[PDB]
Amino acid sequence: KYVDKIHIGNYEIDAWYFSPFPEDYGKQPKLWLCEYCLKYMKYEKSYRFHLGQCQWRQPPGKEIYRKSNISVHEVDGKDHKIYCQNLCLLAKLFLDHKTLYFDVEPFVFYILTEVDRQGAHIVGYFSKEKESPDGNNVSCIMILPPYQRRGYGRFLIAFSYELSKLESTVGSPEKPLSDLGKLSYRSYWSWVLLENLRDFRGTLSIKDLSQMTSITQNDIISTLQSLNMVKYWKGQHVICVTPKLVEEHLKSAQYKKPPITVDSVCLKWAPP
Numbered sequence: 001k002y003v004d005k006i007h008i009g010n011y012e013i014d015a016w017y018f019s020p021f022p023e024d025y026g027k028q029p030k031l032w033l034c035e036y037c038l039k040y041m042k043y044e045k046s047y048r049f050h051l052g053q054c055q056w057r058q059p060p061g062k063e064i065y066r067k068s069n070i071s072v073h074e075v076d077g078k079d080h081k082i083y084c085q086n087l088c089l090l091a092k093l094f095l096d097h098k099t100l101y102f103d104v105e106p107f108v109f110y111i112l113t114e115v116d117r118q119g120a121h122i123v124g125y126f127s128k129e130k131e132s133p134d135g136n137n138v139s140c141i142m143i144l145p146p147y148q149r150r151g152y153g154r155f156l157i158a159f160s161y162e163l164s165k166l167e168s169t170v171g172s173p174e175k176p177l178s179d180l181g182k183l184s185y186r187s188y189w190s191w192v193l194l195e196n197l198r199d200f201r202g203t204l205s206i207k208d209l210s211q212m213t214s215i216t217q218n219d220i221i222s223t224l225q226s227l228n229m230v231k232y233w234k235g236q237h238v239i240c241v242t243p244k245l246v247e248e249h250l251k252s253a254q255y256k257k258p259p260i261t262v263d264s265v266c267l268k269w270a271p272p
């Protein structure tokens with residue numbers, strides 16, 4: 001038997017995929033996870049004892065972003081190995097496009113929480129290779145099921161590009177993406193590029209957009225192609241869209257939900 005259900009915080013969540021928890025943990029009816037330190041437990045009774053003794057009320061590492069009650073912690077996988085291994089085990093219950101990270105040390109994890117008087121409650125995270133040869137600014141991204149399709153994924157996508165901008169580089173998520181990840185990235189790219197096209201007094205090129213957004217030229221071009229806003233001329237893609245056409249697209253339902261924004265002013269991060 002695999003783990004088929006977890007209790008974490010106030011949530012019970014059914015598993016989507018196999019995750020390699022030890023066999024004695026999988027055979028239980030449920031796995032119980034401390035929402036702050038991510039220790040996993042076999043029994044409601046050990047969980048309740050842990051709840052009363054654990055001192056953690058937020059992720060470890062540095063809080064590199066805080067605006068109102070939305071926070072991001074930066075967690076080095078080498079410095080917090082057990083926490084990050086447990087995070088990976090949790091995530092693997094809900095991801096199958098990513099083999100489980102039996103080694104978390106090459107990665108830094110950006111943990112998203114929303115905060116109340118009780119503590120900082122984990123919503124999801126993305127991981128990033130400390131040195132990525134390719135142009136990957138996200139290695140894995142996971143939003144816990146009860147928080148999916150509620151703006152948190154968009155926030156983490158935006159956040160990963162804000163880091164890329166601070167590194168003066170373009171970046172792209174490692175592939176493959178989940179089906180929801182694919183739709184989320186495509187909508188994020190579409191919204192960002194449309195917004196810039198609407199607001200920029202003048203002619204933006206694809207290279208311009210890539211420098212302003214840290215989205216790769218390849219992801220910009222495929223996005224503009226899906227929007228039918230690019231011509232081809234003598235071997236180059238060229239943006240071709242009227243201001244009215246940009247406005248029409250931006251009025252679509254895909255972009256009607258007010259985002260959780262990433263306020264650059266609240267981001268406390270310098271490149272290493």
Ligand SMILES: Cc1cccc(C(=O)NNS(=O)(=O)c2ccc3ccccc3c2)c1F
Nearest residue numbers: 143148149150151152153154181184187188
């Ligand atoms: C990468 C990833 C992985 C797993 C789950 C999610 C997710 O929950 N996406 N839905 S969303 O956050 O509400 C979301 C994403 C991009 C959006 C772009 C434009 C407008 C609205 C958006 C809403 C995810 F984004």
Ligand SMILES: [Zn+2]
Nearest residue numbers: 034037038054
């Ligand atoms: Zn704990």
